[PDB]
């Protein structure tokens, strides 16, 4: 039997989960207009490509994004999902490739039944203490897969979704399904080895962490930045505004080269030292007021490469693999102050740069929306503090025309 209020987790109660979601699907059909129902029908017919598009749409030029006819399906489906918000948390289930969480080898083969202690521990060490960014449309289940269910990988994600998460229950032929648009980071709180129908699986107990991510909506990001850093702009000492404007006006190159070469030890320059101190103090004046995603198009030199390095040809998979082996899971540190943007869109000045850092900035980190300073709004810039450290959680790749580019999912850790 079923209670008259649903649980937060249907667990193994597949029969009630399916019936409840079937009722929900019927109820939500009352609230979708025909363009939204059209978007859903197209998704049933082309889910992989539509989901793929939804993961990387934001990285192109603003006018390329606007001109893509796939925007219609994306926006209409996203609207359909966004407005059926849950009234309390719910737990969902789905399978991932281990590669999704930067475990770039099999946990066990399809034919194997058990998972070694070795592999279990390797997996734990790889996915612990990391916040993994999730994007795009995804089909999830409200019940745990059991005997006779489809189970494509050895990795089962058991994810708690909070109140106000958008979820779209729907029917596809004989099947009741649940669609979400991922817009958050997940943390793996705990992994456990379980057995389902004679085979060992890893079950990852996962929760989410929200961050503001403006992606290609630079106007919205700019409004947010101006709202939070208009006062900041006015609250600096005259030395701090002076040293800040010097930095932004191109002084950054000397200041940062002094930092990178370890000038404060090898060539102490008290003038520069005072500027570094003032700018740092400026960045601590109004700490980043929410968890925030920022984007940086890195030069290859930040990753020990040049334009003519053979290893910078990411169109060859072996170079992507070599990149991952060197950087994925590592912590990197910038002695320099570091420019980032509120927006993910490509821009003329760095149109050809192949390495994109996508950085999770925890609330209260030092930082400032410099583009609140009336002098230059067209960067949508957030400046991060000198000596910042970033954990590289995961490396993804995508095609920009014929050129393979990398997205480094990173977290600011100090």
């Amino acid at each position: 039997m079923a209670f008259i209020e649903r649980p937060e987790d249907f667990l193994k109660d597949k029969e009630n989960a399916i019936q409840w979601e079937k009722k929900e699907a019927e109820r939500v059909e009352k609230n979708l207009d025909t363009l939204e129902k059209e978007a859903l029908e197209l998704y049933k017919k082309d889910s992989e490509q539509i989901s793929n598009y939804s993961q990387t749409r934001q990285y192109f030029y603003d006018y390329q994004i606007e001109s893509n006819p796939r925007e219609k399906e994306y926006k209409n489906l996203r609207n359909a999902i966004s407005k059926n918000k849950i009234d309390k948390p719910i737990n969902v289930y789905y399978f991932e490739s281990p590669e999704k969480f930067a475990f770039n080898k099999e946990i066990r083969t399809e034919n194997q039944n058990e998972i070694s202690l070795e592999k279990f521990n390797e997996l734990k060490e790889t996915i612990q203490d990391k916040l993994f960014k999730q994007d795009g449309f995804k089909d999830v289940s409200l019940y745990e897969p059991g005997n006779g269910d489809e189970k494509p990988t050895p990795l089962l994600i058991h994810l708690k979704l909070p109140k106000n998460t958008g979820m779209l229950p729907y029917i596809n032929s004989n099947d009741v399904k649940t669609l979400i648009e991922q817009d958050y980071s997940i943390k793996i709180d705990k992994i456990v080895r379980i057995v389902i129908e004679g085979k060992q699986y890893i079950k990852a107990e996962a929760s989410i962490v929200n961050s503001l991510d403006f992606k290609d909506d630079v106007s919205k990001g700019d409004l947010w930045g101006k709202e939070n850093y208009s006062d900041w702009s006015n609250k600096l000492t005259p030395n701090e505004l002076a040293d800040v404007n010097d930095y932004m006006r191109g002084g950054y190159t000397a200041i940062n080269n002094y930092l990178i070469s370890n000038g404060p030890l090898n060539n102490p320059n008290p003038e520069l030292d005072s500027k570094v101190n003032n700018i740092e103090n400026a960045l601590k004046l109004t700490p980043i007021p929410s968890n925030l995603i920022v984007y940086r198009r890195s030069g290859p030199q930040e990753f020990g490469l040049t334009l003519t390095s053979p290893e910078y040809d990411f169109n060859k998979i072996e170079n992507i693999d070599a990149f991952k082996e060197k950087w994925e899971g590592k912590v990197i540190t910038y002695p320099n102050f570091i420019s980032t943007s509120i927006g993910s869109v490509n821009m003329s000045a760095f149109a050809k740069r192949k390495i994109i850092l996508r950085i999770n900035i925890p609330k209260d980190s030092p930082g400032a929306y410099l583009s609140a300073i009336p002098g230059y709004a067209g960067e949508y810039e957030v400046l991060l503090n000198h000596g910042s450290k970033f954990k590289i959680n995961k490396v993804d790749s995508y095609k920009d025309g014929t050129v393979t580019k990398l997205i480094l999912d990173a977290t600011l850790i100090n």
Partner: protein
């Protein structure tokens, strides 16, 4: 009574009198080291002195030094008193508001001009050809912009800027000439190579085909006599150098090239005006002087634009001085005279009067 026109660039100041067809004075935008040295002055004193460029990438970055350049302009180059002439200054596209204010403060408070105005360089260059609608490629010594303009208004959200221009091309030519087996490395040698660049370089219509040609013939070789009589040869460097504008990866830059920034600029404009822009691509500035550049731009934009698009590149012979000429025309216009900011208006309103009126 006569107005002054001062077009201040990263490498050169072009200065003269409104009404004239050309600037009376063209001199380097440099200072050496209170009374510190300026126009060529700061190279004949390059010893106890280092030469400094106060305008960087089209933006004034040192106001003390820029006051010296402007002092030099009035008293030494034009031999006029600033108190006796309305003065039209030029500015880069997207010049910060505070920068234009500081230009205005200096003109009235330091030089005590009776009136002044600040005009956008690219808009002046479009105006020089009798146009008020078009997309300008302005490329000088320090910066290159794409500036779309519709009925006299620059469209700031579609302006593209690349910190890649003539001085970068000169430095690149020094490097690749040095790789050929010559040695161009010093300040004086940079001037020589600038001269080689201005005399012998060209943009190839098909770069990969041109490289193949040069590889398998001497047909593209030219000679150049150094000041000491040494004659040198230049080959594929003639076109590899300005190729950098279309392929900024040649100097380690991962930016779009000038054809792509032109396209990006047009694509940021309202769809209704894009054909007007395609049909009125105007080139301005010294770094647009390369033979072959208009044909190559035509070819590259043709490949990006819809197959039905009609594209025209306008590259007048005078385009090294297009900005200055447009300023000379503008300052002379009857309908412009009401637009001058007077000393009286400055006294009444702040430096911020320059937004009211410019």
């Amino acid at each position: 009574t006569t107005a002054l026109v001062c077009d201040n660039g990263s490498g050169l100041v072009k200065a003269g009198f409104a009404g004239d067809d050309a600037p009376r004075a063209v001199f380097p935008s440099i200072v050496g080291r209170k009374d510190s040295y300026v126009g060529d002055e700061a190279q004949s004193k390059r010893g106890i002195l280092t030469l400094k460029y106060p305008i960087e990438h089209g933006i004034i970055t040192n106001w003390d030094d820029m006051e010296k350049i402007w002092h030099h302009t009035f008293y030494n180059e034009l031999r006029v008193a600033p108190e006796e002439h309305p003065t039209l200054l030029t500015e880069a596209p997207l010049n910060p508001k505070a920068n234009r204010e500081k230009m205005t403060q200096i003109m009235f408070e330091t030089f005590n001009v009776p009136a002044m105005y600040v005009a956008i360089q690219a808009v002046l260059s479009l105006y020089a050809s009798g146009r008020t609608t078009g997309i300008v490629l302005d490329s000088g010594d320090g910066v290159t912009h794409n500036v779309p303009i519709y009925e006299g208004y620059a469209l700031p959200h579609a302006i593209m800027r690349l910190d890649l221009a003539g001085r970068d091309l000169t430095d690149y030519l020094m490097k690749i000439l040095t790789e050929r087996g010559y040695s161009f490395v010093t300040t004086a040698e940079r001037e020589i190579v600038r001269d080689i660049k201005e005399k012998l370089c060209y943009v190839a219509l098909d770069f990969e085909n041109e490289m193949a040609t040069a590889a398998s013939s001497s047909s593209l070789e030219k000679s150049y006599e150094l000041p000491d009589g040494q004659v040198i040869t230049i080959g594929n460097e003639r076109f590899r150098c300005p190729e950098t504008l279309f392929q900024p990866s040649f100097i380690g830059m991962e930016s779009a090239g000038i054809h792509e920034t032109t396209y990006n600029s047009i694509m940021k404009c309202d769809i209704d005006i894009r054909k007007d822009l395609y049909a009125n691509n105007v080139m301005s500035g010294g770094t647009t002087m390369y033979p072959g550049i208009a044909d190559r731009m035509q070819k590259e934009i043709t490949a990006l634009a819809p197959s039905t698009m009609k594209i025209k590149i306008i590259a007048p012979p005078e385009r090294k001085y297009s900005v200055w000429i447009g300023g000379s025309i503008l300052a002379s216009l009857s309908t412009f005279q009401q637009m001058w900011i007077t000393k009286q208006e400055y006294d009444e309103a702040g430096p911020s009067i320059v937004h009211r009126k410019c």
